[PDB]
């Protein structure tokens, strides 16, 4: 029973998201523009960067045509807390390109909560 | 400036060379390779080659390099050796905290010991690559030298190579090597503390040896929670992954 | 400790009398029971929430970090307009119309409308009809 009127998913300021290979256990703040920003680089293929010591290599990646991207922030009212059209996509030591789930059992399945 | 300072880790590693002294394209010459940084668990490690004329090797061990010093000695000797840059010639590679860190610790393994070694092979096939008249190669090792001579011979096998335990005090070239690297490592963790000191950060962090309580004293005062150490760090070290498992938020990997 | 992110993909057009969109559980079919839905109550275009998640991601949103590593979708409720979607007791309005009870040419003709539509990519009755889950709770 979660309400979330037009006028939150409409204005709502751009975020950036990357999606990391690896699973940090607690949400939480962080400095990304101290440790991760400044660690990206650019090349023939798509971004280098570090992360806890460890070589990452991403791929920008477009929100499927016809869609929009959304941070809600789960507690108040639904309520777009930024936007996006497009995500770095992260991998391990290697782009991670044809596809894995992502870019694609599919992966993904039902909600609840 | 810093603009570009910071891609001395876009390519992750840095070669800085002279240039190649006339002698030594056309005359034999003799090649010593050795390093410094291979210990800390902060800084650069840096690898380096000197080389120059058989015919010259007096100005070496009869002079006065092979001859345990200071900081402070070490930094004169090597301008002497940058004098006379008529007959003797180097390079380095400064491999950083954090192309360390993304080598070790990739999905893929690679250790230390590769690491250093290629490096070596790396080094010495610029220095054939610029054309010097290269006839033997010694290499300082810590440890048992015959497998570490093995494969350097495999590769180079058109020059000798002399992998010895304790080469820097046998070999003047590789005596001299040693000290560029040594004087090196240490402009590139001087350059660190100035650029921190500069910004208000703490750069006392001691020897920079795991193991010296100082430097384990730093490394605790700060650890971020998401994302560990700054890049000085080499947060492949045994020691390094310790306090981040118990001072930062627990990642699981895709090493599922 | 850290207001839980999420997010989510949407159709372009839900951007544009009062708030509009709700978010519903409902009884999934094919037995499921419990799933949720969102329902935009400028009559009904049925959404069917489904979420991405993979073992070992988490997001930096911002300056932060959440750690699912999940994406949700919301994509218009049923049919083979929703499978380029997802490719990387309440309703009104068109209800008779989009009734026509259980035909095996309902089946007939959505597992080959599906068909044309995974014929457009490379896998391996027309729109989201909001009754493919009005007849597993209704006939049974």
Redesign the interface.
């Given at each position: 029973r979660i309400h979330l009127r037009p006028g939150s998913l409409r204005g709502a300021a751009p975020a950036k998201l990357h999606l990391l290979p690896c699973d940090v256990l607690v949400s939480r703040p962080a400095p990304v523009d101290r440790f991760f920003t400044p660690a990206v680089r650019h090349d023939a293929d798509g971004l280098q960067a570090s992360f806890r010591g460890r070589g990452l290599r991403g791929e920008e990646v477009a929100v499927p045509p016809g869609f929009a991207g959304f941070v809600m922030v789960t507690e108040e009212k639904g309520e777009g807390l930024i936007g996006k059209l497009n995500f770095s996509g992260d991998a391990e030591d290697k782009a991670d390109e044809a596809q894995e789930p992502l870019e694609r059992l599919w992966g993904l399945e039902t909600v609840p909560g | 400036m810093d603009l570009s300072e910071?891609?001395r880790d876009?390519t992750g590693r840095c070669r800085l060379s002279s240039p190649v002294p006339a002698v030594c394209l056309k005359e034999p010459c003799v090649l010593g390779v050795d390093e410094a940084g291979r210990g800390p668990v902060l800084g650069p490690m840096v690898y380096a080659i000197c080389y120059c004329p058989l015919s010259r090797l007096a100005d070496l061990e009869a002079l006065k390099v092979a001859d345990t010093l200071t900081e402070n000695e070490r930094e004169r000797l090597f301008a002497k050796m940058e004098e006379d840059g008529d007959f003797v010639g180097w390079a380095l590679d400064v491999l950083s905290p954090?192309l360390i860190?993304?080598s070790m610790?990739?999905?893929?393994k690679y250790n230390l010991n590769s690491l250093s070694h290629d490096t070596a092979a790396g080094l010495i096939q610029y220095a054939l690559d610029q054309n010097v008249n290269v006839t033997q190669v010694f290499v300082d090792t810590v440890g048992m030298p015959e497998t570490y001579q093995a494969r350097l011979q495999q590769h180079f096998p058109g020059i000798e190579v002399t992998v010895k335990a304790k080469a820097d005090s046998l070999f003047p070239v590789v005596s001299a090597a040693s000290i560029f690297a040594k004087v090196a490592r240490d402009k590139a963790v001087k350059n660190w503390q100035f650029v921190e000191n500069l910004q208000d950060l703490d750069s006392d962090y001691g020897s920079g040896y795991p193991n010296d309580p100082k430097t384990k004293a730093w490394l605790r005062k700060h650890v971020?929670?998401?994302?560990?150490f700054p890049?000085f760090?080499?947060?492949?070290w045994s020691t390094?992954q310790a306090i981040?498992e118990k001072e930062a938020?627990?990642?699981?990997?895709?090493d599922? | 400790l850290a207001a839980r992110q999420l997010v989510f993909l949407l159709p372009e057009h839900l951007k544009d009398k009062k708030s509009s969109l709700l978010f519903v559980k409902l009884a999934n079919p094919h037995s499921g029971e419990g799933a949720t839905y969102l329902i935009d109550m400028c009559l009904q275009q049925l959404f069917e929430i489904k979420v991405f998640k993979e073992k070992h991601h988490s997001w930096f949103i911002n300056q932060s970090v959440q750690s699912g590593g999940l994406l949700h979708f919301a994509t218009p409720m049923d049919p083979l307009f929703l499978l380029l979607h997802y490719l990387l007791e309440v309703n009104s309005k068109k209800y008779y119309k989009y009734s026509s009870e259980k035909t095996l040419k309902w089946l007939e003709k959505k597992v080959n409308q599906t068909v044309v539509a995974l014929k457009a990519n490379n896998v391996n009755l027309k729109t989201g009809k909001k009754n493919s889950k009005m007849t597993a709770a209704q006939k049974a």
């Amino acid at each position: 029973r979660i309400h979330l009127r037009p006028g939150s998913l409409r204005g709502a300021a751009p975020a950036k998201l990357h999606l990391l290979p690896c699973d940090v256990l607690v949400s939480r703040p962080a400095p990304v523009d101290r440790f991760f920003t400044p660690a990206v680089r650019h090349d023939a293929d798509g971004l280098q960067a570090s992360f806890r010591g460890r070589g990452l290599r991403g791929e920008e990646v477009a929100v499927p045509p016809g869609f929009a991207g959304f941070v809600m922030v789960t507690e108040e009212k639904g309520e777009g807390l930024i936007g996006k059209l497009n995500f770095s996509g992260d991998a391990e030591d290697k782009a991670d390109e044809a596809q894995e789930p992502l870019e694609r059992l599919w992966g993904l399945e039902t909600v609840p909560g | 400036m810093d603009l570009s300072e910071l891609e001395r880790d876009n390519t992750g590693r840095c070669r800085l060379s002279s240039p190649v002294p006339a002698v030594c394209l056309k005359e034999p010459c003799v090649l010593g390779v050795d390093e410094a940084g291979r210990g800390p668990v902060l800084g650069p490690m840096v690898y380096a080659i000197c080389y120059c004329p058989l015919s010259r090797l007096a100005d070496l061990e009869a002079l006065k390099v092979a001859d345990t010093l200071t900081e402070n000695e070490r930094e004169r000797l090597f301008a002497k050796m940058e004098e006379d840059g008529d007959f003797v010639g180097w390079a380095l590679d400064v491999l950083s905290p954090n192309l360390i860190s993304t080598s070790m610790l990739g999905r893929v393994k690679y250790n230390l010991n590769s690491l250093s070694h290629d490096t070596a092979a790396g080094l010495i096939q610029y220095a054939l690559d610029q054309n010097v008249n290269v006839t033997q190669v010694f290499v300082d090792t810590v440890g048992m030298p015959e497998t570490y001579q093995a494969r350097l011979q495999q590769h180079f096998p058109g020059i000798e190579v002399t992998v010895k335990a304790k080469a820097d005090s046998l070999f003047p070239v590789v005596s001299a090597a040693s000290i560029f690297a040594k004087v090196a490592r240490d402009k590139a963790v001087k350059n660190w503390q100035f650029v921190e000191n500069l910004q208000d950060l703490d750069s006392d962090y001691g020897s920079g040896y795991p193991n010296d309580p100082k430097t384990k004293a730093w490394l605790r005062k700060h650890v971020d929670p998401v994302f560990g150490f700054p890049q000085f760090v080499r947060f492949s070290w045994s020691t390094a992954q310790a306090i981040l498992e118990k001072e930062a938020e627990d990642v699981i990997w895709e090493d599922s | 400790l850290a207001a839980r992110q999420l997010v989510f993909l949407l159709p372009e057009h839900l951007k544009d009398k009062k708030s509009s969109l709700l978010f519903v559980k409902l009884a999934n079919p094919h037995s499921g029971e419990g799933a949720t839905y969102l329902i935009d109550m400028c009559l009904q275009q049925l959404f069917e929430i489904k979420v991405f998640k993979e073992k070992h991601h988490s997001w930096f949103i911002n300056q932060s970090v959440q750690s699912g590593g999940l994406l949700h979708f919301a994509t218009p409720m049923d049919p083979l307009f929703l499978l380029l979607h997802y490719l990387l007791e309440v309703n009104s309005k068109k209800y008779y119309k989009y009734s026509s009870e259980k035909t095996l040419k309902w089946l007939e003709k959505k597992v080959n409308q599906t068909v044309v539509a995974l014929k457009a990519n490379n896998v391996n009755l027309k729109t989201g009809k909001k009754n493919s889950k009005m007849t597993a709770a209704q006939k049974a």
